[PDB]
Amino acid sequence: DSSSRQYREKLKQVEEYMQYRKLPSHLRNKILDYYEYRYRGKMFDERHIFREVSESIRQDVANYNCRDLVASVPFFVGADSNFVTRVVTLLEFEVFQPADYVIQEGTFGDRMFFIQQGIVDIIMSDGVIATSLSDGSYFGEICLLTRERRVASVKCETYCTLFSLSVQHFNQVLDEFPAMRKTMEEIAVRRL
Amino acid sequence: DSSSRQYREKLKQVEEYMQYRKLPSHLRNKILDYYEYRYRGKMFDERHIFREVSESIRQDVANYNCRDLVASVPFFVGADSNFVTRVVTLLEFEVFQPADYVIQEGTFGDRMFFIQQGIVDIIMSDGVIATSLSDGSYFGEICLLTRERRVASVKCETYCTLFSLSVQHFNQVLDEFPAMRKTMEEIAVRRL
Amino acid sequence: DSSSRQYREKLKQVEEYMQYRKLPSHLRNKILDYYEYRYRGKMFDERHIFREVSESIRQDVANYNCRDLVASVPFFVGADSNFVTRVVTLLEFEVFQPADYVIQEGTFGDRMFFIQQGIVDIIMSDGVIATSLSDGSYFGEICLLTRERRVASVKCETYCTLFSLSVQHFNQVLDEFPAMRKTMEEIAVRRL
Amino acid sequence: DSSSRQYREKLKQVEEYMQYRKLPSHLRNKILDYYEYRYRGKMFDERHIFREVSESIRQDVANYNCRDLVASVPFFVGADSNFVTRVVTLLEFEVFQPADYVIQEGTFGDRMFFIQQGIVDIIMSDGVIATSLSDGSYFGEICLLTRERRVASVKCETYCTLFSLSVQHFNQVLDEFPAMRKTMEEIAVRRL
Numbered sequence: 001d002s003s004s005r006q007y008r009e010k011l012k013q014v015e016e017y018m019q020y021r022k023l024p025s026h027l028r029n030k031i032l033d034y035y036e037y038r039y040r041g042k043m044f045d046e047r048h049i050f051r052e053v054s055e056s057i058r059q060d061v062a063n064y065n066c067r068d069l070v071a072s073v074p075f076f077v078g079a080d081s082n083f084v085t086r087v088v089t090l091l092e093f094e095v096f097q098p099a100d101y102v103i104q105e106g107t108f109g110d111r112m113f114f115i116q117q118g119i120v121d122i123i124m125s126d127g128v129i130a131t132s133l134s135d136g137s138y139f140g141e142i143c144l145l146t147r148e149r150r151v152a153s154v155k156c157e158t159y160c161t162l163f164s165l166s167v168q169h170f171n172q173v174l175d176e177f178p179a180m181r182k183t184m185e186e187i188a189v190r191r192l
Numbered sequence: 193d194s195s196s197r198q199y200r201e202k203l204k205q206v207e208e209y210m211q212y213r214k215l216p217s218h219l220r221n222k223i224l225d226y227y228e229y230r231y232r233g234k235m236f237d238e239r240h241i242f243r244e245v246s247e248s249i250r251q252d253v254a255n256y257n258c259r260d261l262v263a264s265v266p267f268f269v270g271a272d273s274n275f276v277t278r279v280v281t282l283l284e285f286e287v288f289q290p291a292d293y294v295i296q297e298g299t300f301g302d303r304m305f306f307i308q309q310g311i312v313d314i315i316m317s318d319g320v321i322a323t324s325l326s327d328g329s330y331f332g333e334i335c336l337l338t339r340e341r342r343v344a345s346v347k348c349e350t351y352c353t354l355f356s357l358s359v360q361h362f363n364q365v366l367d368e369f370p371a372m373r374k375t376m377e378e379i380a381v382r383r384l
Numbered sequence: 385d386s387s388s389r390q391y392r393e394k395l396k397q398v399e400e401y402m403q404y405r406k407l408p409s410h411l412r413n414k415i416l417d418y419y420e421y422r423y424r425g426k427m428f429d430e431r432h433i434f435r436e437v438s439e440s441i442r443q444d445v446a447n448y449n450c451r452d453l454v455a456s457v458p459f460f461v462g463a464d465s466n467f468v469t470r471v472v473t474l475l476e477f478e479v480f481q482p483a484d485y486v487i488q489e490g491t492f493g494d495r496m497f498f499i500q501q502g503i504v505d506i507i508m509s510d511g512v513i514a515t516s517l518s519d520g521s522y523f524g525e526i527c528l529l530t531r532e533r534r535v536a537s538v539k540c541e542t543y544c545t546l547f548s549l550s551v552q553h554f555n556q557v558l559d560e561f562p563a564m565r566k567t568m569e570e571i572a573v574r575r576l
Numbered sequence: 577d578s579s580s581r582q583y584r585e586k587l588k589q590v591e592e593y594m595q596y597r598k599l600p601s602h603l604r605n606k607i608l609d610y611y612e613y614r615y616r617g618k619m620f621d622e623r624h625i626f627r628e629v630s631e632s633i634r635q636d637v638a639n640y641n642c643r644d645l646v647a648s649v650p651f652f653v654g655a656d657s658n659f660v661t662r663v664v665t666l667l668e669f670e671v672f673q674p675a676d677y678v679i680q681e682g683t684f685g686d687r688m689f690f691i692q693q694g695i696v697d698i699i700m701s702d703g704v705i706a707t708s709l710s711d712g713s714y715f716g717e718i719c720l721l722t723r724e725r726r727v728a729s730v731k732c733e734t735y736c737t738l739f740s741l742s743v744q745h746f747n748q749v750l751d752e753f754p755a756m757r758k759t760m761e762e763i764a765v766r767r768l
């Protein structure tokens with residue numbers, strides 16, 4: 001009930017803002033669809049709760065909420081439990097919509113992404129689709145490894161729920177667990 | 193209605209503060225005129241909404257709100273779409289009033305400015321007005337390029353609505369898109 | 385009464401979040417037990433109050449709240465009053481529960497801990513318990529001194545109330561008071 | 577009225593916190609006296625208002641609120657208007673009480689202080705009072721210039737209203753206006 005009020009609250013002011021900005025209907029609808037899809041009529045916080053509790057509770061909760069993702073990512077198979085715990089506590093939940101470009105070829109990158117659910121296309125600079133990726137895969141790591149630029153664009157086919165890891169956190173966890181930098185570099189190369 | 197309440201709320205406490213500080217009437221009136229001009233009786237947030245949505249929605253909204261500015265700035269003509277998107281997502285809205293000095297000659301600079309609407313005078317250290325700038329122009333870039341000091345003062349003739357880019361973001365976008373540093377340096381020099 | 389309302393407020397939304405996340409009952413109960421143990425039905429802030437007052441009031445309040453801890457830590461015996469004041473103003477209160485791992489062997493460390501109340505086991509990488517520590521002791525300092533990795537795990541036997549000092553603050557206070565780095569290094573070595 | 581409600585609000589929760597912490601009566605009274613002295617039954621914000629307005633309004637308001645201080649500080653006599661404006665916009669208001677040590681000899685310093693109103697004693701490491709300072713004077717600059725340690729303690733005789741400048745801002749304004757570093761160094765030395 002408190003989570004429901006939070007959402008109705010939010011949605012009212014969103015529609016007011018979109019009115020003052022005279023946003024086109026297509027864009028107003030994109031935004032309303034996003035709130036509905038992501039929040040489904042309820043807005044808790046989690047950030048507040050996480051901060052009120054111990055580091056142990058935060059790890060336990062992050063591990064549970066990310067259980068399905070961890071099981072779906074072959075990358076995490078046989079990984080050190082401390083590695084998995086560190087990553088899941090640093091992941092940020094993100095949602096994207098059909099046809100959204102999560103990544104543009106040739107730009108700088110600030111984070112990488114793990115796919116919880118959804119399908120994305122990997123699009124080369126010439127416009128050819130190299131491949132599509134889905135649940136349990138990840139992308140946007142190459143740029144973080146080379147500190148150069150994005151080598152392909154990534155476009156959502158469906159609604160996508162992703163968990164991102166920032167370049168700062170990425171570099172942190174790979175230093176703490178060097179074995180995982182090695183395994184990561186190997187897939188980067190094998191994205192030919 | 194919620195945006196209207198936010199504004200009446202705000203204005204009440206502003207007048208109370210100005211009373212405790214015994215601000216002169218001329219200054220109280222300047223402040224009230226500013227709130228009226230900028231907010232026009234309604235205070236949404238945008239910062240909250242932007243943070244609740246995807247990076248794609250943020251780009252779409254920033255691109256739409258900055259559409260007229262982008263069209264008016266010759267600098268953006270033929271620019272890479274990714275460049276324009278990066279800039280507009282980093283711009284900060286600012287409003288200044290007639291006779292305000294946005295920039296003082298001889299000081300350090302922390303940001304540059306794009307003029308959405310308004311007229312400013314460029315005033316040399318001797319007091320001569322070199323020129324006036326208006327909608328679609330920009331200023332305050334020289335200091336960011338040289339990392340030295342402001343070479344002129346800039347004084348508002350009218351109410352001005354500006355979008356600023358901080359030195360940190362300025363240096364970020366120019367590194368990401370070096371071609372635009374080149375075009376920027378060329379106008380800097382051609383401000384003779 | 386205001387502190388009580390704050391807590392009932394909080395607990396209501398916590399149970400709602402745990403419902404949306406379908407947390408297992410064991411974990412829901414761990415979280416509820418934590419809030420009850422730590423806050424005991426009342427949530428003040430302290431952070432807000434500390435920020436509304438002078439540095440002197442902040443030192444006086446931190447010194448009083450940490451009086452028992454300071455008396456129990458032999459480390460503080462004969463220490464410079466300015467050293468003790470600096471530390472207590474930088475400590476962060478943390479609570480952990482029975483069987484929680486505060487520290488895992490082999491990871492990077494971001495802070496050290498002083499035990500106000502509770503018992504922890506020091507567990508070597510082979511699983512042998514080297515020793516147990518309790519009220520007035522401290523742990524997690526070795527990693528901060530070597531800038532290497534945690535050399536043992538630390539597991540709570542009881543509920544534990546700890547005060548942590550971050551690596552940044554740790555390095556600050558030791559620079560300001562070098563004599564205490566010396567005394568600290570000596571115990572680090574004498575954790576054989 | 578809104579400022580009055582804010583204060584009664586605040587004071588209620590302060591007394592509740594002091595109760596949970598079982599603070600001694602002398603300290604509870606020190607805190608209540610501080611709130612009464614500083615806020616006088618009304619809590620506006622200023623930080624919120626400053627952030628809602630232009631840089632020009634912020635400079636105008638800071639200049640007005642600091643007018644008496646600026647007039648009382650001989651240091652500002654003949655100074656560049658841009659220097660004075662920069663400083664006043666970076667000052668932080670602080671209040672201290674009789675017998676408070678604002679500065680302890682031998683510690684590291686994070687800021688310096690301008691005295692709006694009040695009297696402080698400068699106390700050497702041997703306990704001799706070198707001198708007393710009052711309205712329009714400043715102290716705590718030596719440590720910022722040498723990047724060493726505080727050379728004396730500073731103890732309030734009366735209630736003191738001060739404006740502090742952090743080491744980061746201090747170093748900023750002195751770089752922007754080198755002439756003022758020179759004048760500052762000269763008084764530092766002439767504090768024999």
Ligand SMILES: Nc1ncnc2c1ncn2[C@@H]1O[C@@H]2COP(=O)(O)O[C@H]2[C@H]1O
Pocket residue numbers: 103109122130131138139140141142143144149150151152153154191192
């Ligand atoms: N052939 C490929 N197969 C799978 N993923 C790819 C391929 N080429 C590029 N990518 C991904 O697309 C991402 C785009 O941005 P990055 O260059 O950071 O890293 C990229 C890789 O994660």
Ligand SMILES: Nc1ncnc2c1ncn2[C@@H]1O[C@@H]2COP(=O)(O)O[C@H]2[C@H]1O
Pocket residue numbers: 295301314322323330331332333334335336341342343344345346383384
């Ligand atoms: N002759 C000129 N014509 C147009 N703009 C100018 C001229 N001289 C200076 N400026 C602008 O005035 C701004 C003042 O601060 P900056 O030195 O950062 O950069 C400056 C340029 O943007």
Ligand SMILES: Nc1ncnc2c1ncn2[C@@H]1O[C@@H]2COP(=O)(O)O[C@H]2[C@H]1O
Pocket residue numbers: 487493506514515522523524525526527528533534535536537538575576
């Ligand atoms: N033999 C020991 N006796 C007491 N404390 C210990 C012993 N071995 C390790 N520790 C503590 O266990 C902590 C684990 O993390 P750190 O390596 O940072 O530092 C460690 C010391 O504080």
Ligand SMILES: Nc1ncnc2c1ncn2[C@@H]1O[C@@H]2COP(=O)(O)O[C@H]2[C@H]1O
Pocket residue numbers: 679685698706707714715716717718719720725726727728729730767768
């Ligand atoms: N003889 C003095 N006369 C006036 N002020 C002094 C004297 N000696 C020290 N101070 C001030 O006392 C302050 C204590 O800390 P700082 O060393 O940063 O800088 C100091 C000077 O501002």
